[PDB]
Design a protein around this ligand. Structure first.
Ligand code: HEM
Ligand code: HEM
Ligand code: HEM
Ligand SMILES: COc1cc(O)ccc1CCCNc1cccc2c1C(=O)NC2=O
Ligand SMILES: COc1cc(O)ccc1CCCNc1cccc2c1C(=O)NC2=O
Ligand SMILES: COc1cc(O)ccc1CCCNc1cccc2c1C(=O)NC2=O
Ligand SMILES: COc1cc(O)ccc1CCCNc1cccc2c1C(=O)NC2=O
Ligand SMILES: COc1cc(O)ccc1CCCNc1cccc2c1C(=O)NC2=O
Ligand SMILES: COc1cc(O)ccc1CCCNc1cccc2c1C(=O)NC2=O
Ligand SMILES: COc1cc(O)ccc1CCCNc1cccc2c1C(=O)NC2=O
Ligand SMILES: [Fe+2]
Ligand SMILES: [Fe+2]
Lengths: 155, 155, 156, 156, 156, 155, 156
């Protein structure tokens, strides 16, 4: 079914953001595991899987709309050097992603691509859940102190 | 995550309506139970619980958006003194609630808070199902007569 | 069964305290959840549910006694801005509640409404258990430190 | 254990009321069953059984206190001639019974027989629940009409 | 169905005997339990329950025959002051009861109320089984001695 | 929670009575078992356990009320030299215990410590049941004779 | 079986130590529970129970040996005012207890009461396990710090 060219460009932009996130979150996960912070590692792993599932849905939608899904271009990964930076890097990436999601929804609404809008809204709900997790972790580091926060994520 | 100030004000207005509904429905339920109309009492209790769940979701959303959920200001309860009046009081409250939900959704759309809009759309679906229930009960009173209607809600 | 007018007034005062506590505890619960302190959030949630069940019993008793349960007036919520203050706000509310419960029981006894007395005694038992909980949490914060206390309430 | 003479006298007065209630409710039950109002007949049978259980407990307490339980004297049954009157008869009996229970509890408290008071308070709670049932049934007769009310109690 | 007036009068006389027995056996039961003779107390409780079941059936039959079941008049209880006397009291009551049952059956047969006769015969069989139990217990007291007999009824 | 000083003194006096009863019942139990009267031994053992459970509740209440539970002072044990005396010693102890319970309940009521009253009433109900048991055993000894009574408590 | 008089005196001395320990550990348990240190409270409760079981075996042995078990004399409880002091009070008691156990075993061996020796040796094994627990707890406070040690004992 022939989709709106600009819808497909927006979907490819969102996909590009998900592809960055997949890799950034997977590397952060394996860094935490290597450091022995296995609870952070497992949770970041699951965040990476979630972004993989969103990427799948975006790829499927673009193909249905007779576009070419862009898996070739990979933007800049934001990799932290300690737990605090890694969480902040994830959050900065998520805030860019939700800005881009909002602009894409605006355009889907204007051209009546209501199914693409519904998909983007579901993804946005997932990303806002991830923002909530990240903001809460950074707040916990303040409330319990960094040593305790790391301790609580060892096992 | 920093929410739109007026979105938060709208969410607090909806929360205010839910808080009224919780108490109005809880009292109507216990009145109906006291009167021996336990099928009305039990159905109205479930309506109160549903409003409790909507309030919970609004409180959670407001806190995520870095606002203050107002659980202090309670508006006017519409308490009836007989079965038909209590149903009409619930209906009047629900029609006010859905008007407010539509205005809040408009503003959520205008500032691109699509997750808040989706939460409110879900609440609106629940309130319209309650409106359907209430209009149907009021119609049943007309069709089967008040005495039969009450008889059918004793057990 | 028409009850004593002042008994019903006492029951509505107790109910009014329970209504404040429902909302105060529910907001504190959701604040703690928002902050990542989910074990505190869950325990405070269950305190709010407990007060909802007390409010229900009071409403039922007032209706049986042919009075009007007051769900319209809501007194001042005591909302804290950090964990220690939130617990202390809950404790201050509970100490007001148990004083009111004692005065109500005295009056029930005087007018021989022994069933209302028994209901209030059961509610008083629950509120003293909550006071025990709150005083103990406040003591634990002093013994293990706030950072450790909060750490121990991160995961449910 | 040697109980207070006036406590035992109060306990025997409460027992006397329960013995009336047992017989009154059992006959009402079987009248309703004979008339085809089997839901009323079954509910009233369970009220009779409950009064039998209360009488058992009173008998047991009187004997522990070294009194003689009075099962010989039977006061006046209040038997109605139609469903409304039968429910009202039960209610009139319960209102007398709860008055007597309150006076007995007063005296138990004065002479420090706290266990007898506790037993009487538990009975008082059951009797107030019965009064609630009866008042509600009589209100329903007015709200749904006598014909509908009886229709709703034909089948169990 | 309109029953024979004198049949109903006989049925009310049998019902009166059962109402005595219910109360007599229930009190004896609770006396034995208070004294620590719990096997006697339990057996006598089950005798009381059986008389309650017979009274139910008589009440139901009287109402079917369009009579008024008499639950207001209660004859003289025979309460013993020790185990032997209590058993003898039950026996004296049962021998009066079976005499009355026979006279009632005679009249049912004369006026062709065969269903009432059948109900009374079933009750008569239960009462003769009770007489057998009682006579046997009294014989055992003589054969094993009072002290042994009571010893054998301490534990259930 | 700061308790009434005289309530706490009453609670410590009741606790004192329970501590005597724990030890008196436990010794009587083990004496009966040593004599081969194991049904008496077992029943008296369960009486001792019950008093232990009451003592626990009293200790917990005293600490909640910010008092010091007195586990140091132990009053006079009433130990019998035969079964009849042992039962009578238990009964003498229980009759003192229930008198003290009533005086403590009076004071709880006067100072509106309704929860302490409720605890004491529950303990009083248990002690009255123990009195019933003991009075009944002593009556059975007279009805069946000592040799049969003891025989019935061998196995 | 007529036991050695001095064995019985030693058994009564060990019993006296156990009676102190029962009460001291029970009170420490309930203090920790009140303070919200429930893992410590539960563990100390089980220590108190273990001492109850030892006391029972000693009482039973003394009676078999035809002695009088002394449950009247209760020595000085060592009650701490904070966690470190309570642990050290428990340890001081246990060290006195095991010294007395060794002296009692020596005497049992000398008079050939090998079964009493075996009983005391089993108790000594239990008390040495308690000493290991206590010394380890005090060492952990030094290694992880008091605040962390207490944190780790908040939740069962
Ligand atoms: C801020 C206002 C309130 C909120 C946010 C709230 C929230 C809730 C929630 C989330 C539940 C659990 C529902 C479920 O998933 O099963 C609940 C249950 C309940 N609520 Fe409320 N509630 C509020 C006020 C009240 C009031 C005023 C009453 C009664 C006067 C009440 C009575 C109850 C009862 C009886 C239950 C069922 C508890 C049980 O037995 O499990 N609630 N409430
Ligand atoms: C002193 C008077 C009475 C006493 C103490 C008494 C006591 C009791 C008790 C304790 C029960 C058992 C209830 C339970 O735990 O489930 C019972 C059952 C019953 N009683 Fe009575 N009752 C009395 C009078 C009567 C009378 C006058 C009748 C009939 C007219 C009656 C009919 C019954 C019946 C039908 C049952 C149910 C038996 C079953 O389990 O099927 N009772 N009674
Ligand atoms: C002579 C002194 C005591 C002796 C010989 C003794 C003996 C015993 C024994 C044998 C048990 C059962 C243990 C098992 O489960 O196998 C027990 C349980 C118990 N004891 Fe003691 N005890 C004594 C004093 C105390 C005291 C002073 C208290 C409280 C202050 C106490 C509180 C308890 C409790 C709470 C239980 C558990 C009961 C249950 O719920 O099963 N004991 N005791
Ligand atoms: C998937 O598109 C199709 C749909 C069709 O119906 C028929 C053919 C095609 C493939 C056309 C060549 N595609 C390339 C080539 C290089 C890199 C990329 C892609 C791409 O599609 N995404 C990349 O990253
Ligand atoms: C959710 O509040 C917070 C979030 C935070 O992250 C930090 C602090 C606060 C507390 C600030 C005082 N809040 C009050 C005070 C009084 C009444 C109400 C409230 C409210 O929020 N709703 C009411 O009904
Ligand atoms: C005796 O009735 C009245 C006397 C008056 O002077 C004025 C109005 C009424 C009936 C008003 C119906 N009941 C209401 C109404 C609103 C709120 C509540 C209730 C209630 O019962 N609990 C509430 O919170
Ligand atoms: C509880 O009776 C006892 C307890 C004892 O420990 C020793 C003896 C007795 C029986 C004394 C004669 N009792 C009668 C006699 C006739 C009617 C009644 C009663 C009665 O007790 N209630 C009645 O309705
Ligand atoms: C079976 O009664 C009825 C059947 C009907 O179909 C209609 C009406 C009646 C009630 C007439 C008044 N009955 C009383 C009154 C007082 C005492 C007794 C009774 C009684 O019946 N037995 C008593 O001990
Ligand atoms: C529960 O006591 C406390 C509560 C606190 O919050 C803080 C400290 C304490 C310990 C104070 C010393 N207590 C002793 C000393 C010796 C004997 C006894 C006791 C006792 O309490 N009962 C006895 O039998
Ligand atoms: C176990 O005693 C016996 C064994 C028998 O075979 C025969 C009689 C007796 C009782 C002799 C008086 N006993 C008392 C008296 C007071 C305190 C204590 C005791 C005691 O034994 N331990 C105490 O703490
Ligand atoms: Fe109808
Ligand atoms: Fe830590």
């Amino acid at each position: 079914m022939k989709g709106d060219k600009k819808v497909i460009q927006h979907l490819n932009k969102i996909l590009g953001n998900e592809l960055i996130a997949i890799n950034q979150y997977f590397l952060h996960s394996r860094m935490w595991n290597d450091w022995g912070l296995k609870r952070l590692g497992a949770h970041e792993y699951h965040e990476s899987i979630d972004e993989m599932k969103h990427a799948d849905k975006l790829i499927e939608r673009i193909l249905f709309l007779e576009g070419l899904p862009n898996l070739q271009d990979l933007g800049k990964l934001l990799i932290g050097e300690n737990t605090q930076e890694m969480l902040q890097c994830d959050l900065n990436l998520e805030l860019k992603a939700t800005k881009d999601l909002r602009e894409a929804i605006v355009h889907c609404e204007q051209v009546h691509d209501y199914v693409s809008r519904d998909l983007l809204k579901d993804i946005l709900e997932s990303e806002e859940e991830h923002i909530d997790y990240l903001e809460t972790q950074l707040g916990l580091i303040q409330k319990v102190g960094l040593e305790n926060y790391l301790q609580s994520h060892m096992h």
